[PDB]
Design a protein around this ligand. Structure first.
Ligand SMILES: CCCCCCCCCCCCCCCCCC(=O)OC[C@H](COP(=O)([O-])OCC(O)COP(=O)([O-])OC[C@@H](COC(=O)CCCCCCCCCCCCCCCCC)OC(=O)CCCCCCCCCCCCCCCCC)OC(=O)CCCCCCCCCCCCCCCCC
Ligand SMILES: CCCCCCCCCCCCCCCCCC(=O)OC[C@H](COP(=O)([O-])OCC(O)COP(=O)([O-])OC[C@@H](COC(=O)CCCCCCCCCCCCCCCCC)OC(=O)CCCCCCCCCCCCCCCCC)OC(=O)CCCCCCCCCCCCCCCCC
Ligand SMILES: CCCCCCCCCCCCCCCCCC(=O)OC[C@H](COP(=O)([O-])OCC(O)COP(=O)([O-])OC[C@@H](COC(=O)CCCCCCCCCCCCCCCCC)OC(=O)CCCCCCCCCCCCCCCCC)OC(=O)CCCCCCCCCCCCCCCCC
Ligand SMILES: CCCCCCCCCCCCCCCCCC(=O)OC[C@H](COP(=O)([O-])OCC(O)COP(=O)([O-])OC[C@@H](COC(=O)CCCCCCCCCCCCCCCCC)OC(=O)CCCCCCCCCCCCCCCCC)OC(=O)CCCCCCCCCCCCCCCCC
Ligand SMILES: CCCCCCCCCCCCCCCCCC(=O)OC[C@H](COP(=O)([O-])OCC(O)COP(=O)([O-])OC[C@@H](COC(=O)CCCCCCCCCCCCCCCCC)OC(=O)CCCCCCCCCCCCCCCCC)OC(=O)CCCCCCCCCCCCCCCCC
Ligand SMILES: COC1=C(OC)C(=O)C(C/C=C(\C)CC/C=C(\C)CC/C=C(\C)CC/C=C(\C)CC/C=C(\C)CC/C=C(/C)CC/C=C(\C)CCC=C(C)C)=C(C)C1=O
Ligand SMILES: CCCCCCCC/C=C\CCCCCCCC(=O)OC[C@H](COP(=O)(O)OCCN)OC(=O)CCCCCCC/C=C\CCCCCCCC
Lengths: 91, 123, 50, 55, 231, 77, 200, 96, 74, 148, 140, 55, 68
């Protein structure tokens, strides 16, 4: 009633252990952070597993089947034959 | 007052407090790795290094103007022009077989007078 | 130009390396001092002219 | 109301700031003429004209 | 106080206060067998039993989390019936609804049970919160009674019984101690008691027109800088 | 009236004081401050004009069962 | 309640000055006067009443006494600036509540937003053109005047009219669409051939 | 390892279509637009609900109790309500 | 800097899910996010790591070529 | 306060006026309410509703250019799914009972019934062309109006 | 009050003793200066950015629940569960897909995060000191 | 108050008119900076500051 | 129906301003001019307005210099 804290007439130790409504919200957020450890951990674990499949795919994309080059060397266009020879004459 | 002092520490580097107004200023050390990934580009060297002296015939050097007209490459992919947003959905991407050059115009060209770039505003 | 919003005066020290040899924390140390002297110049003026 | 003279100063300070900063302001005014005429003449009835005309 | 003055407030193109069959262009029309080749309709005669099974599930699936609280099961039953008796007692002619009110309400109740099966329905969470707040107050009374202490509720009951004797001990001309007099005696005690408590400000305005919030501190300025913590 | 003054002095014409104190603060309060979402001991105001129903006799027994004379009334009824 | 005082102090600021603690310096209302309100003259009368009650209606005392400014209004412009910096959206919201009670139509709101953003869009282009003129300056061409509104015998380009007609025909040059030719990637063939020659 | 993972590439997307970099811009705008539209629809049912539950009753009809009003009356009553009920009972049903 | 920002932005999504774990996990109206959030996160990670990995391979091919071709010319 | 703030008043009653039209019995309002939002940025260009999207891309009418395609594709599918709902009898739902014993003859009459089924829809897009052509004619006259 | 504020207290515990006990009440200017830099509960210490997130997180999440909670397009094909005629069933998974695409809103923000920027023209300008270059600089 | 939309048009029309007519508006802004600072910093006290400062 | 009494009200006020601008301006600004600012403010208005007009005149002249 009258022992309720006052920001002016406050002790240092009491402010350190206040634990008001602001902290009550944070403690509820922390309850979710902890409960999400397996869901988040499962995602990162898959990123670590997916990491090794990506390494082999990059080499497959750059070097190809027999180390002579993969689809990294392929480039395609939508230009017609007239558009290409127009650009050359434009150059 | 504290945040006013902290902002003063930052503004010695950032300079202008308003956004979209200017750039910060940081003096860095000079080493062989300055601009190491753009040494291949010539226009970047001229812009950084050379301050050219204007002549009586007040014009940009003819060589600089001539090099500037060699059109750059501009992607065909365009969702900003509604005719291409529709037409490019039915377009067939065919392989562009390398002919041994470095200037194959497999896309459109960044020139206002190009028949596939006239809708683009060059200002 | 460091006090302008979206300046277009690119030739007025905007693209140049501009350092100084004054005290740092400019807006906390130097810039107020310029305003302090300003208040003296105007208070000394009012008291004189009045 | 208590700082009209002061706010009037800072109001004009930023106007001059923008004007002193914007060197191609004439290009902006001219570039704004067409849309200013187009939108006001198109939306006049639906905003103001309806209160003295057809509906 | 204030009554709606527009006499046509409850008028619709379908009639007065009609919220069962609003008027629309594509109105229902009959079908004739001899002329009808095929038809695609979703209506059926399974709503009656689905209305029954839906009640049994909503009751049995919500009781899983009552922990054998008999008083809560009975209170919840009364509340569950209020949700199923809506079409039987509403002003809306649920029997004249556009495309079958029976199928409509059943499908609407099924969406509620889906949430009840997962224990995520707001009425469930509202029930748990309301009950925990109730049991905490009943346990506070029990702990005070086991200690021989008197509850705040008994102090009033005892303080009110004596106030009645004082009033009827002087009310000898008449002898009709109405319920109205009994009531205003308790209210005079409740207002005095409630004002004694340090409660948050509920009314916007106090004795003066001014608001009773922490923000209603106007001039004159008499408060100094705020002081720090004491060691 | 429709001519209340300048735009700068517009927030001045709203205050109406119940006392003769001068000068008068101009600000007219819009809402009540509600900083802490506190559970009100106050009972809900929805329980206002609900006709007699089953909840009346169910609650009567709960309160009557709290007395010896009430337990007799309920069991006999 | 329990956490009311601790919380209320955490949400808002109080006035720390004790300007009104000093009695004689208290203002009668003649420092900041409202000039246009319909109760203008009733306000002056209350100022006159306060000046008279203070002197038992012998205003010669006021003439001889010292007149003070309104110390309560000191440093008010700074204090509003610090609240705007602390929470600009809350300062703007409450300072515009009474003005935002009258809400214009969807058309008017869309015009404010469109013209305001369209003006900022042109300002961004004007800044980019200033960088073009600086590069032109450094490249060896001195510049008399400024801008692109050529007074002489030159072609101008005013800027896309912010109306759908031109916004369907034209679109601005996206710099991210200017690319290095993919033929660059064909130089990696040299690497694959060297790796095999060296036995890698 | 399969070639299907090549779709994860954006360094060299300019070699095939260069379309992904532009379409997702629209998708981000389309989500933003729906967020403003749907949030307004679903949120703005409260003014009607707040009004009807407090002004739609009439004396020529019976107002029937809802689920919430049942729990609040039986399991959320305050102390004064408990006192008033027993105060009426003890005086009239017991002490006459 | 690009790979670090997109990694920090992906980490921001994991915080958004953690900060709202009880809603995404227990409310069935958000089931589609609970089910497909990890699929989208892996694809985002794949793009980030794919680009970084491809960039790293090309850099090494370039460094080893300029050194080998430099000796042949000497 | 939803009774003093005109911003929530306009949005609340507007939405209530839109959802109450579910009694018109078009289809699930929960399905087509999202298409209404897209169609609003097609015809809302006349009222500048696309203004807040001017900085979101290099094309001010991007969302309007996509919505017109969205509006076209999903309206083109509405008749297709309706036939799928009718089933194999879908031709009887359109034309009714046949007249001749020849299935080849009816095949031609049934094709016309299915084409007409779609022409009633696709033909209404010529109305949209008139609205745009008339909108351009005005922008051309105003943009080229005299100023000296 | 939050943990980071409590951490400051244990570190500033002796400093608080000097300002609040000694300086804040000694006399004259040393008092005004110590009472001005007092240490305690923060007046107006709320963080609007934190709150801005909490509000926008909640409002956008209520939209996710609506957009993601849709009747299935697959279940409506059989005409046996809850859906006989749904002429706009092909719009059922547009909003869900649009919300899931929102997870890449910040991952792919700006041009640099959608491609390999060193192969684009704007990168050259940044390395040239945010300076305008001819459009064909990537070729020369 | 009955023509706020219409008067808003003509106001911006004459602003654009002057802006489209005034090609060196930037020169006028910069030429106005000094007198804007001088007269406001000199006359601040006699207009506004006197109400809270000194006299 | 609309308020047909407000028809052509903008045209009518324009013609009254042309007929007698000082009278139209005087009466439309009477209630506002009841609160007159100080001599300093009134002078600043006039000084800054006439100075802006003086620079506008110089810019008009510099344009004739650029045309020559
Ligand atoms: C600027 C003046 C000249 C300078 C001298 C100034 C002298 C000192 C005064 C300075 C202060 C002036 C105050 C002006 C502001 C208005 C004041 C006010 O509040 O009065 C009450 C006013 C209430 O209005 P009301 O008149 O009582 O009745 C309203 C009823 O609903 C319906 O009423 P109605 O049916 O009778 O009429 C409908 C509509 C009337 O219709 C219109 O108003 C037409 C609007 C069309 C669009 C115009 C766009 C403005 C131009 C922008 C372009 C950029 C500038 C440069 C390019 C243009 C070149 C000319 O009502 C209104 O809009 C009211 C405003 C009309 C008068 C003010 C209009 C100013 C227009 C521009 C003037 C020219 C600009 C010169 C600037 C030069 C700079 C160098 O407050 C408002 O709420 C309206 C303000 C407008 C805002 C609309 C909503 C915007 C929502 C956007 C949200 C975006 C959120 C972003 C958040 C960012 C993150 C934090
Ligand atoms: C089964 C029935 C069908 C079901 C319908 C279901 C409808 C569901 C409704 C759900 C409502 C959503 C709830 C949230 C709304 C909040 C957002 C809002 O805008 O409220 C404004 C809110 C309410 O506005 P209001 O002042 O009460 O006025 C409302 C009405 O105008 C009333 O005032 P009024 O009577 O004075 O208006 C008279 C009207 C008179 O209009 C007319 O008489 C005829 C109009 C014909 C237009 C001609 C079009 C020509 C197009 C030419 C195109 C050429 C170029 C095309 C290029 C394409 C490429 C080739 O003229 C107008 O002013 C119209 C207002 C502008 C509407 C723009 C869209 C028009 C298309 C409508 C699409 C839906 C069609 C449904 C089919 C109905 C068939 C019967 O006011 C505000 O300012 C506050 C919010 C402001 C936010 C601005 C940001 C806007 C953009 C973001 C908004 C949020 C996301 C997008 C929502 C969609 C907005 C378009
Ligand atoms: C570039 C292309 C552009 C074109 C785009 C078009 C895209 C269209 C997408 C629409 C969706 C298509 C997907 C169909 C899903 C079907 C699923 C399914 O199988 O469920 C069965 C379902 C039937 O179930 P139900 O109707 O609900 O109930 C059945 C009754 O219970 C049954 O009562 P019942 O038992 O009394 O009936 C007896 C029996 C009677 O059946 C008969 O009539 C008998 C026929 C004769 C059989 C041969 C007899 C030989 C006798 C030999 C005798 C030997 C004697 C030996 C003696 C022995 C000697 C020892 O009936 C049946 O059981 C058969 C009904 C099912 C037939 C399904 C036919 C589907 C053909 C589709 C083929 C093409 C599919 C391509 C898909 C490509 C996707 C990438 O099929 C359907 O519902 C069909 C609806 C499809 C309508 C789609 C119309 C869309 C518009 C298309 C043309 C638009 C042109 C305008 C273009 C404008 C631009 C947009
Ligand atoms: C086969 C070949 C065919 C060849 C011929 C083709 C020609 C086709 C003819 C068919 C078209 C006409 C159709 C009949 C319309 C019937 C509708 C009706 O019942 O009356 C509505 C309309 C309603 O007015 P109201 O109800 O009496 O009151 C108006 C309100 O109170 C509003 O007044 P307020 O006082 O409140 O102020 C606001 C007012 C005024 O607000 C303003 O501030 C605008 C001022 C505009 C004029 C000034 C422009 C600035 C530049 C000049 C500066 C002047 C002032 C300078 C001052 C001195 C400076 C120191 O706003 C207005 O704009 C009012 C206009 C009337 C409403 C119409 C909707 C307009 C929305 C679009 C606005 C943008 C267009 C503006 C057009 C100009 C309108 C006057 O009355 C009419 O004006 C009828 C006009 C029809 C006349 C037809 C005469 C015969 C035509 C044929 C002759 C030969 C032509 C040959 C041409 C050759 C090729 C070029
Ligand atoms: C025997 C004893 C002496 C008797 C002397 C006889 C006195 C006869 C009085 C005759 C009255 C004439 C009545 C007809 C005129 C009434 C109309 C009028 O404009 O009055 C203002 C009238 C009243 O304004 P108010 O708001 O009631 O304020 C009244 C006072 O200002 C009060 O305002 P406050 O209460 O706020 O006080 C603050 C004060 C605070 O002032 C101070 O505290 C100290 C002032 C120190 C001044 C330091 C000067 C430093 C100079 C540096 C310059 C160096 C550059 C030199 C270049 C050399 C080159 C080598 O600052 C001011 O008020 C500024 C006022 C400007 C005064 C300018 C004249 C200053 C010297 C005059 C000397 C006259 C001899 C007096 C000898 C007394 C000696 C004890 O303003 C209006 O509202 C009417 C419309 C005005 C429109 C503006 C354009 C008007 C210009 C044309 C006026 C008509 C023709 C010219 C008349 C003369 C004008 C100066
Ligand atoms: C998953 O579903 C979804 C939601 O959930 C429902 C959403 O809410 C939303 C909505 C999202 C939002 C409302 C969030 C929007 C956020 C935006 C726009 C950006 C926010 C930006 C800021 C708050 C500014 C931050 C500024 C910086 C980080 C620059 C300076 C650096 C700072 C401050 C950190 C220093 C950097 C580091 C790497 C060190 C990190 C330090 C720590 C981790 C210490 C932590 C300490 C403690 C005590 C926890 C979406 C889109 C969604 O998809
Ligand atoms: C009333 C209903 C019937 C319609 C009539 C209304 C229009 C009445 C027109 C009155 C005009 C009277 C004042 C015009 C004088 C100023 C313009 C002028 O003089 O013409 C300039 C010039 C022609 O000059 P020259 O051909 O070179 O001739 C040189 C001769 N030596 O013409 C113009 O500049 C066009 C006039 C300005 C157009 C301004 C556009 C205004 C936009 C109107 C939309 C209103 C939207 C309302 C919201």
């Amino acid at each position: 009633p009258q022992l309720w804290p006052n920001p002016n007439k406050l002790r240092f130790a009491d402010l350190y252990k206040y634990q008001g409504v602001e902290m009550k919200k944070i403690n509820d957020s922390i309850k979710n952070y902890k409960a999400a450890k397996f869901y988040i951990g499962g995602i990162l674990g898959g990123c670590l597993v997916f990491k090794f499949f990506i390494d082999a795919a990059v080499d497959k994309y750059i070097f190809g089947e027999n180390g002579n080059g993969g689809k990294f060397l392929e480039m395609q266009t939508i230009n017609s034959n007239y558009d290409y020879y127009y650009n050359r004459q434009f150059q | 007052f504290v945040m006013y002092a902290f902002a003063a520490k930052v503004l010695d580097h950032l300079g202008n407090p308003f956004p979209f107004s200017g750039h910060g200023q940081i003096v860095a050390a000079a080493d062989r790795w300055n601009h190491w990934d753009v040494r291949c580009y010539d226009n970047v060297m001229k812009a950084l290094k050379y301050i050219r002296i204007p002549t009586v015939q007040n014009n940009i050097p003819e060589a600089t103007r001539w090099y500037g007209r060699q059109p750059g490459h501009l992607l065909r992919a365009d969702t900003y022009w509604i005719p291409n947003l529709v037409s490019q959905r039915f377009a067939k991407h065919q392989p562009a077989h390398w002919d041994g050059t470095q200037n194959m115009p497999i896309f459109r060209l960044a020139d206002p007078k190009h028949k596939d770039s006239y809708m683009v505003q060059f200002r | 130009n460091s006090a302008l919003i979206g300046s277009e005066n690119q030739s007025d020290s905007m693209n140049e390396l501009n350092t100084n040899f004054s005290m740092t924390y400019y807006i906390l140390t130097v810039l107020p001092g310029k305003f302090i002297y300003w208040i003296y110049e105007i208070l000394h003026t009012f008291f004189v002219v009045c | 109301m208590s700082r009209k003279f002061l706010l009037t100063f800072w109001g004009g300070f930023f106007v001059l700031n923008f004007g002193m900063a914007t060197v191609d302001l004439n290009w902006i005014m001219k570039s704004t003429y067409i849309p200013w005429i187009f939108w006001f003449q198109l939306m006049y009835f639906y905003v103001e004209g309806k209160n003295s005309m057809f509906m | 106080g204030y009554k709606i003055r527009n006499k046509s407030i409850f008028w619709t193109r379908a009639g007065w206060k009609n919220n069962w069959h609003p008027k629309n262009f594509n109105a229902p029309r009959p079908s004739y067998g001899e002329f009808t080749m095929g038809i695609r309709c979703r209506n059926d005669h399974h709503s009656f039993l689905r209305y029954v099974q839906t009640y049994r599930n909503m009751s049995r699936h919500c009781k899983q989390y009552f922990l054998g609280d008999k008083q809560l099961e009975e209170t919840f039953i009364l509340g569950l019936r209020s949700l199923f008796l809506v079409p039987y007692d509403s002003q809306c002619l649920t029997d004249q609804i556009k495309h079958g009110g029976e199928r409509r309400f059943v499908d609407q109740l099924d969406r509620d049970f889906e949430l009840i099966s997962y224990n995520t329905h707001p009425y469930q969470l509202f029930t748990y919160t309301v009950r925990n707040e109730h049991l905490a107050w009943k346990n506070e009374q029990y702990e005070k009674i086991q200690k021989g202490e008197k509850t705040f509720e008994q102090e009033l009951l005892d303080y009110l019984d004596e106030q009645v004797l004082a009033e009827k001990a002087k009310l000898r001309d008449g002898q009709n101690f109405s319920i109205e007099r009994m009531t205003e005696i308790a209210l005079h005690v409740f207002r005095k008691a409630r004002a004694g408590k340090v409660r948050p400000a509920q009314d916007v305005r106090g004795p003066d027109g001014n608001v009773n919030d922490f923000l209603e501190q106007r001039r004159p300025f008499e408060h100094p800088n705020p002081t720090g913590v004491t060691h | 009236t429709l001519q209340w003054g300048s735009l700068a002095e517009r927030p001045m014409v709203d205050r109406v004081m119940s006392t003769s104190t001068w000068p008068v603060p101009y600000y007219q309060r819009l809402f009540k401050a509600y900083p802490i979402r506190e559970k009100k001991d106050k009972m809900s105001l929805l329980l206002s004009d609900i006709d007699i129903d089953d909840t009346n006799w169910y609650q009567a027994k709960d309160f009557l069962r709290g007395s010896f004379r009430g337990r007799q009334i309920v069991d006999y009824v | 309640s329990l956490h009311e005082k601790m919380q209320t102090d955490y949400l808002w600021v109080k006035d720390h000055s004790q300007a009104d603690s000093w009695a004689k310096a208290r203002t009668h209302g003649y420092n900041y006067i409202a000039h246009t309100v319909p109760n203008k003259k009733e306000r002056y009368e209350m100022i006159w009443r306060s000046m008279g009650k203070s002197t038992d209606w012998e205003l010669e005392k006021f003439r001889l006494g010292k007149k003070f400014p309104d110390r309560g209004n000191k440093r008010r412009w700074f204090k509003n600036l610090f609240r705007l910096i602390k929470n600009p959206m809350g300062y703007i919201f409450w300072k515009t509540y009474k003005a935002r009670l009258a809400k214009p139509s969807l058309i008017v709101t869309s015009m404010f937003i469109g013209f305001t953003l369209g003006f900022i869009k042109l300002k961004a282009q004007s800044i980019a053109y200033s960088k073009k003129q600086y590069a032109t300056l450094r490249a060896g061409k001195n510049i008399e005047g400024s801008g692109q509104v050529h007074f002489g015998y030159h072609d101008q380009k005013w800027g896309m009219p912010a109306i759908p007609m031109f916004q369907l025909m034209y679109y601005e040059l996206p710099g991210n669409s200017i690319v290095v030719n993919p033929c660059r990637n064909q130089n990696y063939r040299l690497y694959f051939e060297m790796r095999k020659k060296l036995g890698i | 390892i399969l070639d299907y993972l090549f779709l994860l590439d954006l360094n060299d997307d300019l070699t095939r279509k260069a379309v992904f970099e532009q379409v997702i811009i629209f998708i981000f705008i389309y989500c933003t637009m729906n967020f403003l539209a749907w949030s307004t629809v679903v949120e703005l049912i409260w003014p009607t609900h707040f009004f009807n539950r407090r002004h739609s009753s009439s004396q020529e009809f019976i107002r029937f109790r809802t689920y919430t009003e049942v729990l609040l009356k039986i399991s959320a009553y305050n102390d004064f309500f408990y006192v008033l009920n027993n105060y009426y009972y003890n005086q009239k049903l017991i002490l006459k | 800097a690009t790979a670090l920002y997109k990694s920090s932005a992906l980490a921001g999504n994991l915080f958004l899910y953690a900060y709202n774990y009880n809603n995404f996990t227990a409310n069935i109206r958000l089931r589609t996010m609970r089910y497909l959030f990890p699929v989208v996160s892996l694809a985002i990670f794949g793009n980030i790591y794919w680009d970084y990995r491809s960039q790293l391979v090309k850099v090494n091919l370039f460094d080893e070529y300029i050194q080998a071709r430099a000796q042949e010319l000497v | 306060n939803p009774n003093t703030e005109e911003n929530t008043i306009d949005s609340d009653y507007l939405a209530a006026s839109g959802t109450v039209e579910a009694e018109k019995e078009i289809t699930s309002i929960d399905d087509y309410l999202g298409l209404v939002f897209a169609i609003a940025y097609v015809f809302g260009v006349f009222f500048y509703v696309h203004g807040w999207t001017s900085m979101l891309s290099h094309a001010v009418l991007l969302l309007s250019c996509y919505s017109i395609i969205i509006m076209f594709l999903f309206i083109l599918g509405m008749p297709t799914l309706l036939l799928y709902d009718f089933g194999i009898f879908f031709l009887a739902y359109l034309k009714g009972a046949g007249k001749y014993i020849s299935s080849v003859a009816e095949m031609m009459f049934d094709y016309t019934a299915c084409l007409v089924f779609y022409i009633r829809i696709l033909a209404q897009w010529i109305r949209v062309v008139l609205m745009v052509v008339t909108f351009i004619s005005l922008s051309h006259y105003v943009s080229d109006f005299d100023i000296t | 009050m939050n943990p980071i504020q409590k951490a400051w207290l244990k570190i500033l515990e002796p400093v608080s003793y000097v300002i609040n006990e000694k300086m804040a009440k000694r006399t004259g200017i040393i008092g005004k200066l110590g009472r001005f830099f007092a240490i305690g509960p923060r007046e107006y210490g709320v963080h609007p950015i934190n709150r801005m997130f909490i509000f926008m997180n909640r409002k956008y999440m209520a939209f996710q629940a609506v957009a993601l909670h849709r009747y299935s397009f697959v279940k409506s094909l059989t005409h046996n569960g809850f859906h006989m005629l749904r002429v706009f069933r092909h719009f059922a998974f547009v909003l869900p897909a649009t919300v899931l695409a929102g997870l890449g809103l910040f991952v792919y923000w700006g041009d640099d995060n959608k491609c390999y920027s060193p192969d684009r023209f704007p990168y050259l300008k940044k390395r040239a000191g945010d300076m305008a270059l001819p459009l064909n600089s990537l070729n020369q």
